């Protein structure tokens, strides 16, 4: 077993999130967001039509040149 992995921290609020369900930016390993911070990003970005990386840096989908966006099902899980 394991008591805990090495510490990993929310990019925006600095809270520990290793070994939890959190949002991992596909193309930037250090971009990690807890669900509370992600909820804020979804609400603030939602009016544009798409929700991109909560860092605001429009990080790409891996292998592509366009920013990755949340899926509807992920928004549902995060807002639950």
């Amino acid at each position: 077993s394991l008591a805990t992995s090495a510490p990993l921290c929310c990019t925006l609020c600095h809270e520990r999130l290793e070994d939890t369900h959190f949002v991992q930016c596909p193309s930037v390993p250090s971009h990690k967001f807890c669900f509370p911070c992600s909820r804020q990003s979804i609400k603030q970005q939602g009016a544009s039509g798409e929700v991109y990386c909560p860092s605001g840096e429009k990080c790409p989908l891996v292998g592509s040149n366009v920013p990755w966006a949340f899926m509807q099902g992920e928004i549902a899980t995060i807002l639950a």
């Binding site: 939890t20 369900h21 959190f22 949002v23 991992q24 930016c25 596909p26 989908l61 891996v62 990755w68 949340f70 899926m71 099902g73 992920e74 899980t77 995060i78």
Partner: peptide, 6 residues
Amino acid sequence: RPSVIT
């Protein structure tokens, strides 16, 4: 992509 939710 896989889900962004870990």
